Amino acid sequence: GSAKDVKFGADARALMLQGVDLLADAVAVTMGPKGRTVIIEQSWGSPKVTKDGVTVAKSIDLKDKYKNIGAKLVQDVANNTNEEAGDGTTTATVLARSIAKEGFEKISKGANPVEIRRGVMLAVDAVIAELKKQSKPVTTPEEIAQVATISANGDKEIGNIISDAMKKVGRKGVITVKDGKTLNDELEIIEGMKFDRGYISPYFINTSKGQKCEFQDAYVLLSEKKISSIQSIVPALEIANAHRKPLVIIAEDVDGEALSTLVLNRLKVGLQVVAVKAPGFGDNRKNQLKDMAIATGGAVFGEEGLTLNLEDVQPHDLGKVGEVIVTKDDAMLLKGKGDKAQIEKRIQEIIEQLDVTTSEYEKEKLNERLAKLSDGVAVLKVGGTSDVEVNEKKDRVTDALNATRAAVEEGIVLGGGCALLRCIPALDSLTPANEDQKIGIEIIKRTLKIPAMTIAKNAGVEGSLIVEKIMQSSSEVGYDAMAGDFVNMVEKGIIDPTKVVRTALLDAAGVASLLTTAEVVVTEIPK
Amino acid sequence: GSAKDVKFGADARALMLQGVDLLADAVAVTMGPKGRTVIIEQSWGSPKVTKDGVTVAKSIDLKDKYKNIGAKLVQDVANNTNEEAGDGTTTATVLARSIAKEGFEKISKGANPVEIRRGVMLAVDAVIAELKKQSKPVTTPEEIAQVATISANGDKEIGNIISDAMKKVGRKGVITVKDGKTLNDELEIIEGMKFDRGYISPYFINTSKGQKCEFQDAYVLLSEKKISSIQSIVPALEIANAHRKPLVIIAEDVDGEALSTLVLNRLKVGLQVVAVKAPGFGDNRKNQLKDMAIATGGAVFGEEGLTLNLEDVQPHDLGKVGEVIVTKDDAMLLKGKGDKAQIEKRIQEIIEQLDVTTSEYEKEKLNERLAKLSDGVAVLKVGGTSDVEVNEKKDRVTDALNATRAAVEEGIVLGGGCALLRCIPALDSLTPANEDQKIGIEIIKRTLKIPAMTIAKNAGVEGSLIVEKIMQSSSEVGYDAMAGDFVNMVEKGIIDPTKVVRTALLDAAGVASLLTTAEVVVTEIPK
Amino acid sequence: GSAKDVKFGADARALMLQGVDLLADAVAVTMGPKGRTVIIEQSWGSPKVTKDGVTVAKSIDLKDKYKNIGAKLVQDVANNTNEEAGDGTTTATVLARSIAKEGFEKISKGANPVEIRRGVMLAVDAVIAELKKQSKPVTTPEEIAQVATISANGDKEIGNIISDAMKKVGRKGVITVKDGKTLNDELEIIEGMKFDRGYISPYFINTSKGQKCEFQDAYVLLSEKKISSIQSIVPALEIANAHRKPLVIIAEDVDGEALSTLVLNRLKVGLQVVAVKAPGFGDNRKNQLKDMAIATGGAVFGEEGLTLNLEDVQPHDLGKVGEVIVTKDDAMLLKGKGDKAQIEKRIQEIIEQLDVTTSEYEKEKLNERLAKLSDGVAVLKVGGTSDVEVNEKKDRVTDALNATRAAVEEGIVLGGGCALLRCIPALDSLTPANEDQKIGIEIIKRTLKIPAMTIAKNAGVEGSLIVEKIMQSSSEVGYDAMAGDFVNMVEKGIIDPTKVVRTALLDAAGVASLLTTAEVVVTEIPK
Numbered sequence A, B, C: 001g002s003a004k005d006v007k008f009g010a011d012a013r014a015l016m017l018q019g020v021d022l023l024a025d026a027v028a029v030t031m032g033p034k035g036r037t038v039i040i041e042q043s044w045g046s047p048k049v050t051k052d053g054v055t056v057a058k059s060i061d062l063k064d065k066y067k068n069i070g071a072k073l074v075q076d077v078a079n080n081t082n083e084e085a086g087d088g089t090t091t092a093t094v095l096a097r098s099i100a101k102e103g104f105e106k107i108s109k110g111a112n113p114v115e116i117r118r119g120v121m122l123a124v125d126a127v128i129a130e131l132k133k134q135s136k137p138v139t140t141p142e143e144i145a146q147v148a149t150i151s152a153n154g155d156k157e158i159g160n161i162i163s164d165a166m167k168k169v170g171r172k173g174v175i176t177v178k179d180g181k182t183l184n185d186e187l188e189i190i191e192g193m194k195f196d197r198g199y200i201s202p203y204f205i206n207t208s209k210g211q212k213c214e215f216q217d218a219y220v221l222l223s224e225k226k227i228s229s230i231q232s233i234v235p236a237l238e239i240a241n242a243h244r245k246p247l248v249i250i251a252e253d254v255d256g257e258a259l260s261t262l263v264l265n266r267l268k269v270g271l272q273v274v275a276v277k278a279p280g281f282g283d284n285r286k287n288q289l290k291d292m293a294i295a296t297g298g299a300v301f302g303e304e305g306l307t308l309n310l311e312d313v314q315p316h317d318l319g320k321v322g323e324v325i326v327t328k329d330d331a332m333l334l335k336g337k338g339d340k341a342q343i344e345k346r347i348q349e350i351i352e353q354l355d356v357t358t359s360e361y362e363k364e365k366l367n368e369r370l371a372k373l374s375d376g377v378a379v380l381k382v383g384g385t386s387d388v389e390v391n392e393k394k395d396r397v398t399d400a401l402n403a404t405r406a407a408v409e410e411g412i413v414l415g416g417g418c419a420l421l422r423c424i425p426a427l428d429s430l431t432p433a434n435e436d437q438k439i440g441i442e443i444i445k446r447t448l449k450i451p452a453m454t455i456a457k458n459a460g461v462e463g464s465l466i467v468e469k470i471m472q473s474s475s476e477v478g479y480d481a482m483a484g485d486f487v488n489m490v491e492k493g494i495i496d497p498t499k500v501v502r503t504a505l506l507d508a509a510g511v512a513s514l515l516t517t518a519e520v521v522v523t524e525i526p527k
């Protein structure tokens, strides 16, 4: 209904490119081992110092609406790359800027930008297939330490402590990063668990940074069925509210008036409470229910063998824990006060049931339940002299954990932008169907040099000469930008997770090649 | 009451034409296989990239009131075409601009624009009759795939998946479109049902995009009698709202107090509920309610043989569903948790009843009932790397489904604007009753070239030469604008639904020829 | 108490004339068969395209308050003509402007404007008497179709469908107009009724356009007495609102707290109820009340014989009415779901009491009962491709029904402004009492040529030559402005209702001749 401004063609495209260029120029200075940091003013408290690309991209909004559209699209690129990979957001930003620039340069009257986008997506699929061909799996703890060191801006202690954490709790174990009070980082092994069900309502969030629910020393209330009626929840809520510990309800499906009562009590008087769906289906859900009820030292409600009701809930049937974290991705329960002999009896029963399984799917879930109650979780405490230092370091530790998980999942390729450089002959062999698809393929071919050029540019040398020397070199040779030398990248440990590279390329290509199809931009008139 | 500005004659008409020209210029760049996209700034979140003409038209409002009047009239054209056909909104926009421009050019002292509008309507009726003579029915699935491919901007995978969906669930089956988490699209066959009754009141909408109601894992309280009385709904409401679930109440006529209380609780505390009228009239109605009660696994209330009241409602007597989508046009129910034995018993009872029916009207209703309960629905998940790409692709998938349903309903004509080009000799034979009707007929005669001209213009060639070569060609020959050639359009599959073409022409002609009769424009003084 | 601006004499009169001229110039372009339309911006939704004079007059307010006074006086003229005649508002506007202009020109130091107004009144009385002499009654359905065709801007199908409606339901039958979902207009005869009772409390409106109360499937709680006790009616209102349907109350007198409480609760919770008085007087009212109870299929309350209480309301005592339109002029109930056998028994009883009655005073009302119970109500659906087209056409259908009803009531005269032209010799024979009355008589004599001049001017020819030729012609000859010829206007069907002509002249003359007596204008200072 508000009045709009409509711009056409080249002028609108140049304004959107100005926004893209501003955000990408801010992000690109943080790339590689000689990248520098960005200081972001906060409304409350101290400014934030970061090297993280999506953090810089999310903090930049522009007054000019036409520039802000391009800034928001590159912000979408960085956020999507952060969501499905956890690393590589700066690479995705510079790739998206390169694709948008090359697409805007190649638009004429006879050009078909939608078919150019088709050629871009075909070229990116070819590059991703070549990246999967080039990938090799991680087999050693040394490779894990190398991935974590590279992803932490060359910090070898971060790599060492992440490698030690995955040596203790396993390559698929739960690792947690929080603040540290000391000067140095430290690794702690504690009894905790984590399942793959987040929150249900978005109104249980108090920590505004990670968008997670952080309660400490909480009450735990399990259920087999759904804790449903008002007469079945007013006792539970009244005892769990009067007693000074927050409530964690584990139910099946929570969407309704008990949930809205929880939201309203959080709003008005501040009731600390959360409701979580129960992971697993069939008897696996009930077995994990019993496992968590024993581990928390509480009780199972609405079951079949006891028929315990929720109208008579006693204070001795609620589990006591020392921390619960409810992200939208997972739920995490640390330092339960369950009975030690009960946990040992449950682990002996799980061993007895492990001895009598041969179906290769029941045994996998039984081993998962065995490694939940016994292997424990790892907690990384990040040290530093101030909150701004600790937050800056925590960004890199989170990046390194995400990259190491990605590398365990999907393997490793050469670092320093060389993995994308070695996929250019995969695009040389392609046969385009028309001129527009050839334009798109050549756009991707030019874009593949951008990460290595950006790393070399931040190191203070001429990136085009570096990239030309790499392309003229053998496939194992690349540019150590920290030492300023052409080395064997795998031997020197300058390696990247394959998932991160292909994620950054795909997420940049889709959004940027869609943006380059635009003829008309409609914005709201600024009041 | 507010002060007004009154403008007369040619100046007011030129201002309204400026508004029409701005909106139609923004819409026209998206037309045909070489059309480009439009980016629309959203107040919240990411900008929207679209090729949809009605979406571009709806997003444009102008500060100048006189321009905004013309913009709103072309908005009416595009919205009406979208509402009655689902496709062809860009064609209707450019036809409306052409009619408004030619009508404004032909206004003089002696001209009678109401009689010119009469001539325009007569010419449009003649063109529609010629289009109906031109139309041929769809008989093959290859034609189905061709319609869906053309309507999806030449995307052949969209055409293939829509053809496969209509192979599985039938050419009149229920197909829905939602988001996909993956890169690629996917088709699934999900058990469910859809009936043709919308909501009762417009305060049941949370999704602000489609103006629909999307609830998940709900319960259904259905009654043959009207669920009316406060003492007959409030116990049922308390049992249904206590339990954490959404609610679907199905009744006959709901026009007083109960859902007003439901709306009041929705506004205050967040009551998730919807109330829907019951399809059918008489024995067909109660048959459908029994069928959906069996499908959802609940109970029938207010019946005549069991005499079950709405006061005594138990939690086991309501139907468990996994999704409900309530639009104004229709309502649908997805993944009912009804018992499988009673569903198979109901389908056997339907077969047994169909064995003893020969009235050719109850048979059709019973076949509709077995297609509700057994044939299932198709769900298309649209894939992509980001929400902006997914929404842009979802627009084209929705357009392709709408066009394919239109083509099943009313047949197909030539694509590329050639179908309207072949109705010009139908206007040559007309005999106008006076000079003003001849002016209107000639306005429509020049307007019929506009769609093919616009498609050729967007392809980067001279539209007038292309259209002239099309008239000099045989009736089966037209311009493939994607390949830039003159081809047999039926053999190459460049075809359009007849309903879409005639709907776009009618909706453009009516509004634009009413606009061209204006001598005086009254607007509000801007504060 | 606010500060005022006071203007004197010729300057104030010229500013008021500027406002009159602006509004009349906007209205006058819509006059006659070659009139053009006016587009009015609406704050919500689409603009309104109209040919209706009072609609244009009501939409124009001026910032200059001196101009706005004249604009609002001509708006009063148009509104009064629309209220009593239902047509002829453009004629009344141009007549009022002519009288105001001629009166302002003739004001000097020795002129007495009040005596000029007296001469205007005497001249208008003479013209109205001559119009009544010239009038002839309508005797054929062809004349009915001709009146409805002329009043619908020459639309012959509107005239035909109105003539068919009055053939089916009678020349005094109930005909309504609503929207059509199709392209063409449709006529339907359905069961219903209408009684002339304006609803007492004016705060039961749900449609802002027609100022009508439009309810769907309301309940009928009809009673003969004054609906008095709140302890009696609160159960009844609670049952009616709580059975999920609206309520219609038939009362004797409502001037207190329960109706105000219903209005206030409508404002708070949104219950739907209307209260109207009962047609008839005495036992006629009770007989009609029994008739409406039988028609609506409900139950009579507060009757003298049974002494039935308003507390005891059965779940089916409230009758069902399927369409409620209660304007500020009348009340009207359609699609009453009454017992068909009871309705046939009631009409048999009415026939049995028809067969012997010889009073012709209550027998006329009993004949009205016979023509109210079963002769039916005509409904016209107006078709079109868009809401703006449908509303524009609905304005003309409403004008045509109003004019045809007026012509049935009071006869027909020549159209095209010729009827007023043939009353100029009636003013020639007048003998004024002084010079000021002579001035007023000459003002009306010059004004009588204005409608024919305006119709000829809108047709693109010179109006004064046309009027001079008409005055030089025989009494049956006038100007067909549509064909641009001089014809026998009765045989060509260009006729006007006598009531419309005399109402437009009287309503223009009174207000405009009162306006021309002004020496001083007092306005508020604009803040």
Ligand SMILES: Nc1ncnc2c1ncn2[C@@H]1O[C@H](COP(=O)(O)OP(=O)(O)OP(=O)(O)O)[C@@H](O)[C@H]1O
Pocket (backbone or CB within 6 Å): A030, A031, A032, A033, A035, A051, A052, A053, A054, A086, A087, A088, A089, A090, A091, A092, A150, A151, A154, A399, A414, A415, A416, A417, A451, A455, A479, A480, A481, A482, A483, A494, A495, A496
């Ligand atoms: N010593 C090095 N020599 C060459 N390249 C290196 C070296 N150390 C790291 N790199 C490369 O630098 C890149 C990582 O840079 P950086 O961590 O700043 O950005 P990102 O991973 O794209 O984004 P972000 O960390 O902001 O989410 C990888 O390509 C990595 O291989």
Ligand SMILES: Nc1ncnc2c1ncn2[C@@H]1O[C@H](COP(=O)(O)OP(=O)(O)OP(=O)(O)O)[C@@H](O)[C@H]1O
Pocket (backbone or CB within 6 Å): B030, B031, B032, B033, B035, B051, B052, B053, B054, B086, B087, B088, B089, B090, B091, B092, B150, B151, B154, B399, B414, B415, B416, B417, B451, B455, B479, B480, B481, B482, B483, B494, B495, B496
């Ligand atoms: N390869 C092609 N060659 C020629 N004409 C084509 C080709 N592909 C599609 N068309 C034509 O393009 C038109 C469809 O264009 P488009 O889908 O952009 O607009 P629309 O259907 O009018 O509106 P909208 O899709 O925005 O609601 C049809 O007339 C169709 O026949």
Ligand SMILES: Nc1ncnc2c1ncn2[C@@H]1O[C@H](COP(=O)(O)OP(=O)(O)OP(=O)(O)O)[C@@H](O)[C@H]1O
Pocket (backbone or CB within 6 Å): C030, C031, C032, C033, C035, C051, C052, C053, C054, C086, C087, C088, C089, C090, C091, C092, C150, C151, C154, C399, C414, C415, C416, C417, C451, C455, C479, C480, C481, C482, C483, C494, C495, C496
């Ligand atoms: N073909 C015609 N030739 C001459 N006069 C005509 C013709 N058709 C209609 N008229 C005259 O035009 C006048 C009606 O004009 P119009 O309907 O535009 O205005 P109105 O009735 O004064 O007001 P409104 O319809 O706006 O309430 C009548 O005097 C009618 O006789």
Ligand SMILES: [K+]
Pocket (backbone or CB within 6 Å): A030, A031, A032, A035, A051, A052, A053, A090
């Ligand atoms: K970085």
Ligand SMILES: [K+]
Pocket (backbone or CB within 6 Å): B030, B031, B032, B035, B051, B052, B053, B090
């Ligand atoms: K389009």
Ligand SMILES: [K+]
Pocket (backbone or CB within 6 Å): C030, C031, C032, C035, C051, C052, C053, C090
């Ligand atoms: K008029």
Ligand SMILES: [Mg+2]
Pocket (backbone or CB within 6 Å): A087, A088, A089, A151, A399
């Ligand atoms: Mg990194």
Ligand SMILES: [Mg+2]
Pocket (backbone or CB within 6 Å): B087, B088, B089, B151, B399
């Ligand atoms: Mg289309």
Ligand SMILES: [Mg+2]
Pocket (backbone or CB within 6 Å): C087, C088, C089, C151, C399
């Ligand atoms: Mg009229």
